[model samples]
Target: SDGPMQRLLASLAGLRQFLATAKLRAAMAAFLLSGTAIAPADARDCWRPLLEHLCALHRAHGLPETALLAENLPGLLVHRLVVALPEAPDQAFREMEVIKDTILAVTGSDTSHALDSAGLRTAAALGPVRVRQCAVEWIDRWQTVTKSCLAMSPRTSIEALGETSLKMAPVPLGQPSANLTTPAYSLLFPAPFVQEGLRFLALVSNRVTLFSAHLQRIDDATLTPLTRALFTLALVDEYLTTPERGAVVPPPLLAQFQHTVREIDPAIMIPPLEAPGTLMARVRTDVAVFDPDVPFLSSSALAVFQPAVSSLLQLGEQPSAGAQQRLLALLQQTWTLIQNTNSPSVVINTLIDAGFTPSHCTHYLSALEGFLAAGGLGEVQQLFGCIALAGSNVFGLAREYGYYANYVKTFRRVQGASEHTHGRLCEAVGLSGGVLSQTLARIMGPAVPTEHLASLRRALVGEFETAERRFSSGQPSLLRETALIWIDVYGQTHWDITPTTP
Candidate 1:
């Protein structure tokens, strides 16, 4: 008898031989090399053949075991597809279509027969749900992958991939609802296909609308909250669906955009404000009280507030002296609020409503330190060098904020925190990170001036160095890898930058 590993390998090889192709072979190689069994390209490449073979063997011949085996194959294929596929929307769609077609063909039985037979019904029901779920998951994965791709390869036509993906995948429904499962199949493609052609078209059309020259001309006074909210939603949607495209927005603009969205829809923009004197609150409070050097509450509040202050500062052709003075006063008030509030999240939310930035952040940091010294609230020393390094590095700022925003949201969700508050915070951070990373790459690349490029390079290098130090110090973190991949992609597309080895 063969050993377990050898037997497993032999069985897998047999499965591959039955569904033979050079593409499948390569995918298998990749999977084996990585010690992971999933191979997306192999699945994508052999889906048609696999489906045809299974349908003929099982569906027509009533080979239930064969059908069950075939059903399991697609899941493996889907796993690979999620990881390895290139950021091509059309390709994603085509792959999806193949899987959907195969599923439908294999399950082309009467409802009674399908339900009775474990293989047929499971395969049939899974066809629609899996396709939609895969589409959504792929779209999300595309966002992150595309961001990293574009950060390194900014000049390439990656945005087109996003547009195409949206077009191919669409919403798969007539109207948008929280429920992701119910397919608007009749509105787009047939039952098995369940394509949402128009919904996608609408999404793409709305996305392209924001890039129009006319969009910038529309004043906030004339723009309704709904319109702004929809536009922001579109940005968030594009960020998730096509992160590379979403990444093209400049960092400063992104900062302002997120701040504006939070102001307009706090429900979808701000994170949960930690209530004062609670256990977590006391931890923060105690940190402030004891550390005296730690500005935890102050920094947290500024993180919340400065986005809004920054947006207001950018709204005009030239600010009148009076407008500048008004902006200064608002900033001052933000400072005062940070000093007094037991919960600085409220202060930050107020500033977010106004828009602020790193320049504004410096002021808040000072206020935080001063307040700690004056009131003896807590010991407030900056523990993470990453935070200080982030202050000087734009991409570092983007990554730090993005990571924290996600962490906080995840924490809140797990803790059963307010959904509306967390949702908005998550959206803003997502947009901010996506846009900032993209913008920094664009501004620092071959397209811009040498001086600006040099500045961006310095920031990138500092961030990379900081990440290295953090990892070297025995901190369990992904920041170094994240930073390295970003620089590799953005600095020179000539280098092949694959994911780290396990």
Candidate 2:
């Protein structure tokens, strides 16, 4: 038994020496050419002679004694094996498990480390096609691992998986591609990895908010770790939790998260994002600079969760007046900073659509006092349209407070309100009824000229007829009432106005 194992290994050692020192090495075009087209399975034909050899040797001597006996022999064998596998990337991938099975048969242990080595070796030698395949494989593996981690325990998975999770970017030189000379991956990660990381971060944000101590902890130890995890998530929420993508964190969870943060400290200040450079670049840089184990800066945590908190304010159940005031102050302030942002305008309009009360319009306008004087009337109109679309309550609030003269205009043409975003401004305008006349009277002064009202009257009459046919029993008659308001306000010479059928 010992003699057979010794003979095989001795033969392998001799072959190794011959290959290293053979005079025909440079002229060995036959061997090199055949090697390129060889399948991983075909290549393994050369290794079967050693499988039983290594397996029996390890079984008899155990792993360490066997390793000591061979020294560099096993290392050289694996190198030769790795050198041959990269040509058929798919075959190489499938063959890794077969090789691992052989490793396990010999070592009688978990093959994970051995399997990882095989992929790493193969990864190191990859050409363009193989590089791309390897990246696809790694991303697939990451998705599986990420799901498994979450399934086992989402709350602690990020902690358990730690940096080892996202750091496993196999294609470090570039994204896997058909083009051999693709640009290098970012200073931190490949583009695909970063995108996956962003999605993972968003998913983890949704999961942890379900049960995490970050929403409940006062012990900064318990609080800061997950808070940092969630803050990281928020910074990327725009990418993954967009309305187009559908919100991952449900409204109730956001509502509770906001309530808890406010309950802890009503006066807590959460600032808007101030991205000094490209947002993604800045986020990646911040993540790199901040160590995972370090305590999260309190101010930064506050700044990051603002978007989520803004979403929370839009929920059906309102925050308490005190809570609302504090959040509204912060949210409106945050809005000013992000007026140039598309996503914030979306969030602003969505929130206003869901929960803006008359009280909110007054409060929002008061905060805009300075902003408006600085020639931000257009901005105010844009935002007020957001508030105005929340319905008649806002209209009444703006009218009751007498805000139409300087800061508000009935014909300001607010475009971004969620309610009428789908249809013409005429529909929302015609739907507003007396609110329009009320505002027009104030803005145009008491002696408002109806001479230019022809276009406005035609649109209202058409909308009134459309609404007459469209109205179901118990619906509001804003369309017909609006047309009547036009007739009454303008003192029409002659125009037929129909009442709602119901």
Candidate 3:
């Protein structure tokens, strides 16, 4: 009886002090004393006090509880954190610990929902991978909080939102969940905030298509800023998009992340089409404003690519320093030419010769990879074909550098045929097969037994067929030529190719 009485006194005293300090103290205390449910109108007032109380109790009393009684409490709390947290780094850092403590103190079946709700929405909003890492760190610190507290709440308690609402139960449920959840150690998907980061990634990812449509309409001077902006974005995008880079979060997060992509809203998260000038200017602004301190932006690869990236972006006109700088300048120039449909031909012979040194090929491939990724496959096909025909072995160097094989592996997934575009992209798939076949022929010099061949064949046939079906006309001649080249070299030694009648 005394224990219960003490508990009641402690609870009352704790709440009394809590309200004494709350911003909307009178109204909150008024509802409580009147034995009335907290109105939705006063939800924010109630929310602020509850959060502060929960945090204060944990830090001081080491865990104090009074029934959390409200309608849409979790919704209100989550909404508050998501909107408010990012407004200041210092405050976010301080509050996140208390939030971490609050979350760890949470108990009951709703634990998963509570965790899942916060994790999915927060990760989805914090655009940078680094910000997502912060989220990951917050989740990770749960184990640490338990260590410090020497206890874990086995379950949390909740009562109904409105009306008589007397019985306490496990955490509330039935919210539309992405079903993305994880333990204290990790997240289901460390989703880059799709609303901004991924949208930026996509804009850079498709700059070629976006730029080409408006190229003739825009001024020459504008191209430099546009190109540079995309180049900067591409650098960040590469790190974020790299599949093999161990997710800053754990593997389980990335695995769960794979399933939730389909649920993203296109209108909200996806960038819409824009004119070349409009897109470039916006991109330039975005690049200018991008936080350079983001760990990925300051990486060695970024530094290596920076001179050229910066120059194109027109950030600075620093003089070229060395062979590496010169080669990058040439490579960037070649990409610029390739992007310019008006420039009847792009010759990378100079670039190839300059780029043939030990590590230069890797850099060349890095630039090429970005170019290809940003919807420049049609342009890339021309470059690759030129390299193969110009008596250069850069592709072989790319293979030896260990990035070419990966390039081919990923290249398989790029959809090469597009009905919307008038230029070579509709036929890019077929041309891609031809360029790759020619490059392989130049490298292998008569196919012997090799898995490289097997993978190449699979990719060629796969992309070719995919494009074939999408082409309004039955299989196009470019694809037919690719098959012919495939047949002429391997001679059905590995996989049979029935050259369809043209």
Candidate 3 ranges beyond 4 A from true positions: 1-98, 101-423, 426-502
How high is the CA lDDT of each candidate model? Answer: 0.31, 0.31, 0.29
| Per-residue lDDT over 220-313 for candidate 2, one digit per residue giving the tens place of the 0 to 100 score | 3434433433443342233223333333443444454454444332222332232222222222212211222333423223323322333332
Pick by TM-score: which candidate is best? 1
Candidate 3: worst-modelled 10 consecutive residues by lDDT: 171-180
- Candidate 3 per-residue lDDT, tens place, 1-502, comes to 2222222233434564553334233333332223222222233333344434433332343211111212112421222232123423245445445544442332222432332333211112111232334444534543343222211111111211221111212111111011112222122121212111212222222222212222221222322332322332332232222333321222332333333323333221211221121211232222321123322222212322322433332222233244334334444555444333221111222232222221233343344434444543323233432332221232232221111112233223222221222223323334344543343334322212234334434443544454344332364423234333533343232223232322
Question: Using alpha carbons, what is the TM-score of model 2?
Answer: 0.23
lDDT of 2 at 220: 32
Error of 1 at 418 (Å): 18
What is candidate 1's lDDT per residue for 440-501, written digit by digit as tens?
23321111122322343354344334433432444343333432343334223212223232
The CA lDDT at 38 in model 2 is: 25
Compute each candidate's TM-score over C-alphas: 0.29, 0.23, 0.20
Off by over 4 Å in 1: 1-37, 48-65, 71-76, 84-123, 128-351, 354-362, 370-502
Model 1 worst lDDT run, 10 consecutive residues:
281-290
Ranking of candidates on lDDT, top first: 1, 2, 3
